[PDB]
From a paper:
We first obtained three structures from a non-cross-linked sample of the 167 bp 5S rDNA nucleosome, which contains a 10 bp linker DNA on each end. The three 167 bp 5S rDNA nucleosome structures, which we refer to as closed, open I, and open II, lack density for the linker DNAs and differ in the interactions involving the core nucleosomal DNA. The closed 167 bp 5S rDNA nucleosome shows density for the entire 147 bp core DNA, which is wrapped around the histone octamer, and the open I and open II conformations show additional flexibility in one or both DNA ends, respectively. Thus, the 167 bp 5S rDNA nucleosome exhibits conformations with wrapped and unwrapped core DNA ends. Specifically, R77 of H2A near the DNA end upstream of the TSS inserts into the minor groove at SHL −5.5, contributing to the stabilization of the DNA around the histone octamer in the closed, open I, and open II conformations. PCA revealed that the main source of variability corresponds to the attachment/detachment of the downstream 5S rDNA end to/from the histone octamer. The transition between the closed conformation and the unwrapping of the downstream DNA end is indicated by the fading of the density between SHL +5 and SHL +7 and the increased mobility of H3αN and H2A residues 107–116 in some frames.
pmcThe specific interaction of proteins with the nucleosome is central to the regulation of chromatin function and dynamics. The tardigrade damage suppressor (Dsup) and vertebrate high-mobility group N (HMGN) proteins bind specifically to nucleosomes via a conserved motif whose structure has not been experimentally determined. Here we used cryo-EM to show that both proteins bind to the nucleosome acidic patch via analogous arginine anchors with one molecule bound to each face of the nucleosome. In addition, to study nucleosome structure in the context of active chromatin, we analyzed nucleosomes that were reconstituted with a promoter-containing DNA sequence from a Xenopus borealis somatic 5S rDNA gene.
Author numbering:
A (entry chain H): 29 to 121
B (entry chain D): 29 to 123
C (entry chain A), D (entry chain E): 37 to 135
E (entry chain G): 11 to 118
F (entry chain C): 11 to 119
G (entry chain B), H (entry chain F): 21 to 102
Amino acid sequence: RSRKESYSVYVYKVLKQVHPDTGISSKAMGIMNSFVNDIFERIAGEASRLAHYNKRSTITSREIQTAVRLLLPGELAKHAVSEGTKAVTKYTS
Amino acid sequence: RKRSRKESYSVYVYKVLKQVHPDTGISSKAMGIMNSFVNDIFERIAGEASRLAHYNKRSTITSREIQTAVRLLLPGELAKHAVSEGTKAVTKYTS
Amino acid sequence: KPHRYRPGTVALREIRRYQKSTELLIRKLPFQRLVREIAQDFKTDLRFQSSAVMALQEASEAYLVGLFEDTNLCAIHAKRVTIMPKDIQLARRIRGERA
Amino acid sequence: KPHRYRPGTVALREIRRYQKSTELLIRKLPFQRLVREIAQDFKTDLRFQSSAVMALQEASEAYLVGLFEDTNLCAIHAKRVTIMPKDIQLARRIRGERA
Amino acid sequence: RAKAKSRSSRAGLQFPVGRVHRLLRKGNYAERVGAGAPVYMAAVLEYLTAEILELAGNAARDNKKTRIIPRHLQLAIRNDEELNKLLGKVTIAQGGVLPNIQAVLLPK
Amino acid sequence: RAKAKSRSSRAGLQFPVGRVHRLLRKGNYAERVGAGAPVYMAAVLEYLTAEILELAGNAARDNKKTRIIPRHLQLAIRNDEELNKLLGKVTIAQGGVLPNIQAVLLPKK
Amino acid sequence: VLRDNIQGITKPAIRRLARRGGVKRISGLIYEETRGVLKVFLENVIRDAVTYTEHAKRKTVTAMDVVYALKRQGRTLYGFGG
Amino acid sequence: VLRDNIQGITKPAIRRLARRGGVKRISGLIYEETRGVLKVFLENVIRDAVTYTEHAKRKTVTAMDVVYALKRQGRTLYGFGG
DNA sequence: CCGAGATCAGACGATATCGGGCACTTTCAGGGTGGTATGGCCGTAGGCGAGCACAAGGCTGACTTTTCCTCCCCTTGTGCTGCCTTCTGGGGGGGGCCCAGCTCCTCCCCATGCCAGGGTCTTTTCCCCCAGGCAGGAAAACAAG
DNA sequence: CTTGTTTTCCTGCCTGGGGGAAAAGACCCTGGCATGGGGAGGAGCTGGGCCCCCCCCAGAAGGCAGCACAAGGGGAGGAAAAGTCAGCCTTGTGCTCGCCTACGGCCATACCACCCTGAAAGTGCCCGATATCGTCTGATCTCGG
C-alpha cells in the first residue's frame, strides 16, 4: 500500500478563495495539477541552467526571479515577480 | 599573474579527423563549431538520461540510460550505429 | 417537391456544432486497433493501458484539428475554400514536419 | 541601342551568387546601431561584446533567410512569383509566431 | 516573521513551501538550494494558479455552470492572450477548441 | 581489456572518458554516475564527430580545399538526411545555405 | 488488428475533424493524405513511448510513457497524469 | 544611436537576403514588413540576453549571453562558443 | 418581401453519479544543534570596449523604360455537397482468467570519498605552406536579326 | 538558327597570415584503500488488461440529383526590374582613455546533515444535490414563390 501526492489540497484552497461558489471536476483537477507540475519543472530547470551558467552551486531567489522573467510573458512576469517578492519579504521578516 | 585555463574538445576532434581523413586540416572557426556540437549533444543526451533515471526513480545514470537516450534522440541509422559503437566500447572496456 | 438545404449551410452548421463540442470525433475501437497495429512493428505482445490509448487518441485528435486549422489558411491563401492535399503538404512543410 | 538583360535573369544570377556565398548581407554598422537602439529600451548604458553583436547579426540573417524560404513557398502555392506581405504573415502564422 | 509556525503560513501562501523545497532539493537542480527559493516558487505557482482558476470560473459562470470542467480551463487559457502564449504548445485533454469561423467561409 | 593506463585507451576511444565522467558528475544530472556511462557517451560523441568530419571532409574535397571551413560542415549537415534531422534547429555561423532554386522560378521554352 | 486498420479512420471521422478545424469544403484526397499524416505521427509517438516501456523493463504501455513521449516531441499533454 | 535606426536594413540588404532565400521577385511592400519582423525578432532575443546580463550582475552583453538567449528559443547557434 | 419547414433554444420533472465533507493514520515537514564551505566584500590590474580623425570607394538612393506579371471577368464541367436507404460494427453489459506490475527482505557488488603522483591537456612561439588576390585568356550563356 | 556582348571560370604568379608542431608547466585523472547504500534477485499478492458472448441501433457506405466552385483562358494596366549617375557613409587604420570584469585573499553566516515529534494530508466511507436526459413547446434561420 502506497500513497501519492498532488497539488489537490492546495488548488482547491485557492479556488475557494478566488471563486467561493464554483467547484471543480476530477479531470479538471488533474489538468490543473499537470499545469503546476509543468510550470514547476520549467522554472526549476531554468534556474538550474542559470546557476550552472554563473558558476554558482546554490539556487537562490534571484535565480527563480530571473527564471520567471525569462519564462513568463510581460504582465504575467510583472505580477509573478511582485508576488514572489512580497512573499519572500514577509517570510524573511 | 596567470590567466585561467580553458578546456575544449579540440584535441580529440583533431585526432578523429586525422583518423577519418588523414590529409585535410580544420580551420579555427570550424573547430569552434565542432566544439559546440559535441557539447550540445552531450547536454542533450545527459539531460535525457537524467530525466529517464528520474522517471523510474533511479539515482544512478548508467549505460542503459545512455543507450535509451541515444535511441530516443537520434534518427534511425544514426541511433543504430551509435548504440552499436557504444555497446562495443563498453564491452571492450569491461573485458 | 421536398425542402432542400443549399450547399454550404449544413457544412457551416456542422462546423458550429463540432467547435462547441468536446467529444472524441474518431471511433474508439478502430483507433485502438490501429495503435495496437503500429506498436507491433516496434515490439510484439505489447499490453496497452486504456489510459494510454485514450492519451494517444486525444493527442492525435488535437494534432489533426490543429493541422486542419492551418490547411484552411493555406487554402484561403490560394483564393479557395476547398482544402486539398497540396495545402496539407505546404502546412506541414512550413511547420517543419516535412522540410 | 545598347545591350539590356531580360527581366528575371539577373534575379536568378543574384540568387545563385548569394546562395553560393557565406558572407553577411546586412552591413555591420547599421545593424550594430539597430541592436544598440533596441537594447536601450531594456537597460540604459549597455556595453556590447563585439562577438555578441556579430552573433546577433548571424542569427538575424539566418532567421530572415529561413523565413524568406517559407514566404517563397507560399508565393508559389498561391500561383505567383512575387512575394507580398500577406505571404510573410501566413508563413509566420503557420510556423507559430502570430498564432 | 517571528511566529514559529508552518513555512507556508509564515509566508502567507496556500501552496506547500516544504514540499516545494523538498522537490527542489531532490530533483537534482543544484548542489544547494537556498531558503527563499521555495518561498518564491510557491508564490509564483500560487499566482499562476489563481490567474487560471479565476478565468475558468468566469467561463463556468458564463455557461450557467457551477463546476469547472476541462472545457472551461481551455476556454480561459485560449481566450487570455498571455496564458495562450505561456501554454502555447499544451494540449488540454477534453478541452476542444475555441469557436472560430473564417469570415471568407460565411454566406454573402 | 585489462590494463593500468588511461580509461580512454582501455576502451579504444579518442575522446576523454575521464572528462566525460567529470562533466556528468558535476553537471547535476544524477546523484550517481555508473562506470560505463562515460564510456558510452565518449563513444557516441566520437561516432557523431567522425560522421560529420567525414562528410565535411568529402565536401571540402569536392571544393578543392585542404582545410575544413564552416561552409563545408553546413553542406555536409544539410546534405545528409539523417544529420539534418538531428541538427534541424541549429545555425552554423558563416555556414550559408544549401543552393536551391524552385522549378517554377526558372526560364521556360 | 494485424492488417489494414488505417481504414478504421472512416471518412466521416476525418470530415468531423476537419469541421472542428473550421474547414467548409474538403476534396476527395484529403482522406488518404490525412490517413498518411495520422500514421506518420502515431508511428513516432508509439515508438518514443515503447522506448520508455522497454527501458522500464515493462510489457504494458502505461499512460505516463505516452505522456513523456508526447512531451519530448513538444506536444505537452495535460490531463492524463503528470 | 537613439532614434530611427531601423532604416539601416536598407532595401538592397533585404533584397540580398531574399535572393539568398531563393526569392525571384519581390513586391514593394515587403521591406517595411521585413523590417518589422526583424525588429520583433531582435526585441525578443535581446530582451533575454539583457536579462542574462543583469542576472550576472554585469554591464556588458556577452556572446555567451546572446548564444544562451538564442538557445532558449530553440534557435541554437554554433560557432561563438557554448 | 411573403409564407412553410427544419433546427436550435429554453424549461421543468427526475435520476443517478460524482463532488464534498468526516474520521484514522502515517509519513513527511519542522524545531534544535553542530559544522563547514560557499559566496560576499575589498583590493589590483589590464584587457578590451568605447570615442575620434581621415580618406576613398564601394554601395546606396534616385530617375527612366518597359516588359511581364498580377488582377479581373467569363465560362464550363467536374467534383463536391446534401439526402435516403442498408446494413454492419462499435458501444455496452456481464463473466472468467491469468499474467504482469508493485511491494518487501537479503546482501553484495558497485559507486563514492580522500590522498599521493604524474602524464595528459593548456598556453605561447614560430615558421612555412595553403588560401586569397589579381591579371590575362578562354569559355559560356543570353538576347535581338 | 548565327554573331555580338557581357559574365564566369580557369590558370599562373605573388603574397601574407594562420595552422600545425615544439616547449614548459600545471592540474586533474588514475591508482589504492575503506565504506555505505542502492538495486538485483527471489518470492508473494492481486489489479487490471485480455478474451469471449449477446444485443441493438447509430453511424458509415453507397447512390442519385444537381449545383457551385476550381480552373483554364483572354485582356489591361501598373509596378518591379534593369540600367545609368551622383553622392554619402562604411570600413579600414590608427590613436587614446578609462571602465569594467575577472582574479586573489579572507571570513561569516547560511545551508546540509541528524535527531525526534507532531500535525498535515492521503485514503476510505458516505450522503446529498447538480448535470444530464426526455419531452414539450417557443423562437429563429433558411429557402422557394
